[PDB]
Structure 1
Amino acid sequence: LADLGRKITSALRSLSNATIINEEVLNAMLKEVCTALLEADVNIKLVKQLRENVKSAIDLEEMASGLNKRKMIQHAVFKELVKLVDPGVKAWTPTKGKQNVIMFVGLQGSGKTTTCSKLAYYYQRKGWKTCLICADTFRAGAFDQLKQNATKARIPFYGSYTEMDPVIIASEGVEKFKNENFEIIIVDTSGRHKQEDSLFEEMLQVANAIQPDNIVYVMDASIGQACEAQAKAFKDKVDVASVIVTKLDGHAKGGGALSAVAATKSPIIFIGTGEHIDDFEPFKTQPFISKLLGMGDIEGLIDKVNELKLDDNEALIEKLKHGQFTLRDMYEQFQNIMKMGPFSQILGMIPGFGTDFMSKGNEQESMARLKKLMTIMDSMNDQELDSTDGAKVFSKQPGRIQRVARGSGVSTRDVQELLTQYTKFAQMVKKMGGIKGLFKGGDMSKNVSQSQMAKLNQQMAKMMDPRVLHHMGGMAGLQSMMRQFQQG
Structure 2
Amino acid sequence: HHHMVLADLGRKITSALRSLSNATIINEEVLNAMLKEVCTALLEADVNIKLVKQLRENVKSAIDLEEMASGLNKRKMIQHAVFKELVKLVDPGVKAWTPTKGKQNVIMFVGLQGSGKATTCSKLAYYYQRKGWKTCLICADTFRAGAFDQLKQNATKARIPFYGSYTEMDPVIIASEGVEKFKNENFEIIIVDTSGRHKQEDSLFEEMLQVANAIQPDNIVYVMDASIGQACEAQAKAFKDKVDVASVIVTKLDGHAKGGGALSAVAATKSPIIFIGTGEHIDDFEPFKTQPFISKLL
Category of TM-score, reference length = shorter chain: over 0.9
Asked if structure 2 preserves the Cα contact closer than 8 Å seen for 1:221 and 1:250, the reply is no
Distance (Å, rounded) in 1 between the aligned partners of 2:230 and 2:258? 13
Paired residues for 1:295-306 under 5 Å: none
Asked if structure 1 preserves the Cα contact closer than 8 Å seen for 2:225 and 2:252, the reply is yes
Give CA-to-partner distance per residue, 1:315-365, whole Å, 9 cap, x none.
xxxxxxxxxxxxxxxxxxxxxxxxxxxxxxxxxxxxxxxxxxxxxxxxxxx
Distance (Å, rounded) in 1 between the aligned partners of 2:203 and 2:73? 60
In the TM superposition, what is the alpha-carbon distance from 1:143 to its structure 2 partner? Answer: 0.7
Asked if structure 1 preserves the Cα contact closer than 8 Å seen for 2:111 and 2:204, the reply is no
In the TM superposition, what is the alpha-carbon distance from 1:163 to its structure 2 partner? Answer: 1.0
The 1:131–1:196 alpha-carbon spacing in structure 2 relative to 1, beyond 3 Å, is same
In the TM superposition, what is the alpha-carbon distance from 1:44 to its structure 2 partner? Answer: 1.6
C-alpha RMSD over aligned residues: 1.8
Give CA-to-partner distance per residue, 1:91-126, whole Å, 9 cap, x none.
111111111000111111211111111011111111
Asked if structure 1 preserves the Cα contact closer than 8 Å seen for 2:48 and 2:230, the reply is no
Q: Which runs of 5+ in 2 are unaligned?
A: 1-5
Asked if structure 2 preserves the Cα contact closer than 8 Å seen for 1:132 and 1:186, the reply is yes
Report the secondary structure of 2:7's partner residue: coil
Q: Which residue of 1 aligns with 2:182?
A: 177
Distance (Å, rounded) in 1 between the aligned partners of 2:240 and 2:207? 15
Structure with more strand by fraction: 2
Asked if structure 2 preserves the Cα contact closer than 8 Å seen for 1:108 and 1:190, the reply is no
Give CA-to-partner distance per residue, 1:230-272, whole Å, 9 cap, x none.
3322222223421111112131442443453344313212112
Distance (Å, rounded) in 2 between the aligned partners of 1:240 and 1:263? 17
Q: Which one scores higher on RCO, CA 8 angstroms, separation ≥ 6?
A: 2
Give CA-to-partner distance per residue, 1:38-82, whole Å, 9 cap, x none.
111011222121111101110212222663111111111111111
Asked if structure 1 preserves the Cα contact closer than 8 Å seen for 2:155 and 2:162, the reply is yes
Specify which of 271, 292, 296 is matched with residue 291 of structure 1.
296
Report the secondary structure of 2:227's partner residue: coil
TM-score in terms of structure 1 length: 0.57
TM-score in terms of structure 2 length: 0.92
Distance (Å, rounded) in 1 between the aligned partners of 2:210 and 2:228? 27
Asked if structure 1 preserves the Cα contact closer than 8 Å seen for 2:51 and 2:89, the reply is no
Asked if structure 2 preserves the Cα contact closer than 8 Å seen for 1:214 and 1:241, the reply is yes
In the TM superposition, what is the alpha-carbon distance from 1:201 to its structure 2 partner? Answer: 2.3
The 1:254–1:123 alpha-carbon spacing in structure 2 relative to 1, beyond 3 Å, is same
Which structure is larger by alpha-carbon Rg, 1 or 2? 1
Distance (Å, rounded) in 2 between the aligned partners of 1:140 and 1:228? 31
In the TM superposition, what is the alpha-carbon distance from 1:195 to its structure 2 partner? Answer: 4.2
Asked if structure 1 preserves the Cα contact closer than 8 Å seen for 2:47 and 2:260, the reply is yes
Asked if structure 2 preserves the Cα contact closer than 8 Å seen for 1:38 and 1:44, the reply is yes
Distance (Å, rounded) in 2 between the aligned partners of 1:196 and 1:3? 31
Report the secondary structure of 2:259's partner residue: coil
The 1:198–1:19 alpha-carbon spacing in structure 2 relative to 1, beyond 3 Å, is closer
The 1:203–1:62 alpha-carbon spacing in structure 2 relative to 1, beyond 3 Å, is same
Distance (Å, rounded) in 1 between the aligned partners of 2:17 and 2:45? 17
The 1:119–1:14 alpha-carbon spacing in structure 2 relative to 1, beyond 3 Å, is same
Asked if structure 1 preserves the Cα contact closer than 8 Å seen for 2:46 and 2:230, the reply is no
Give CA-to-partner distance per residue, 1:162-192, whole Å, 9 cap, x none.
0111111011000111111111000001126
Give CA-to-partner distance per residue, 1:285-306, whole Å, 9 cap, x none.
111111122xxxxxxxxxxxxx
Distance (Å, rounded) in 2 between the aligned partners of 1:224 and 1:30? 22
Asked if structure 1 preserves the Cα contact closer than 8 Å seen for 2:230 and 2:265, the reply is no
Report the secondary structure of 1:150's partner residue: helix
Asked if structure 1 preserves the Cα contact closer than 8 Å seen for 2:112 and 2:196, the reply is yes
Asked if structure 1 preserves the Cα contact closer than 8 Å seen for 2:112 and 2:200, the reply is no
Specify which of 250, 261, 270 is matched with residue 245 of structure 1.
250
In the TM superposition, what is the alpha-carbon distance from 1:228 to its structure 2 partner? Answer: 2.5
In the TM superposition, what is the alpha-carbon distance from 1:146 to its structure 2 partner? Answer: 1.0
Paired residues for 1:376-395 under 5 Å: none
Q: Which residue of 2 aligns with 1:102?
A: 107
Give CA-to-partner distance per residue, 1:209-242, whole Å, 9 cap, x none.
0111011110011014543223322222223421
The 1:199–1:214 alpha-carbon spacing in structure 2 relative to 1, beyond 3 Å, is closer
Distance (Å, rounded) in 1 between the aligned partners of 2:116 and 2:15? 34
Asked if structure 1 preserves the Cα contact closer than 8 Å seen for 2:109 and 2:222, the reply is yes
Corresponding residue pairs, total: 293
Asked if structure 2 preserves the Cα contact closer than 8 Å seen for 1:223 and 1:252, the reply is no
Asked if structure 1 preserves the Cα contact closer than 8 Å seen for 2:236 and 2:266, the reply is no
The 1:65–1:263 alpha-carbon spacing in structure 2 relative to 1, beyond 3 Å, is closer
Specify which of 204, 217, 229 is matched with residue 234 of structure 2.
229
Asked if structure 2 preserves the Cα contact closer than 8 Å seen for 1:232 and 1:263, the reply is no
Distance (Å, rounded) in 2 between the aligned partners of 1:123 and 1:63? 49
Runs of 4+ in 1 over 6 A off after TM superposition: none
Asked if structure 1 preserves the Cα contact closer than 8 Å seen for 2:97 and 2:245, the reply is no
Q: Which moved more, 1:106-115 or 1:33-42?
A: 106-115
In the TM superposition, what is the alpha-carbon distance from 1:204 to its structure 2 partner? Answer: 1.0
The 1:29–1:197 alpha-carbon spacing in structure 2 relative to 1, beyond 3 Å, is closer
Asked if structure 2 preserves the Cα contact closer than 8 Å seen for 1:221 and 1:245, the reply is yes
Distance (Å, rounded) in 1 between the aligned partners of 2:258 and 2:155? 28
Asked if structure 2 preserves the Cα contact closer than 8 Å seen for 1:192 and 1:200, the reply is no
Asked if structure 1 preserves the Cα contact closer than 8 Å seen for 2:251 and 2:278, the reply is yes
Asked if structure 1 preserves the Cα contact closer than 8 Å seen for 2:21 and 2:76, the reply is no
The 1:130–1:2 alpha-carbon spacing in structure 2 relative to 1, beyond 3 Å, is same
Report the secondary structure of 2:230's partner residue: coil
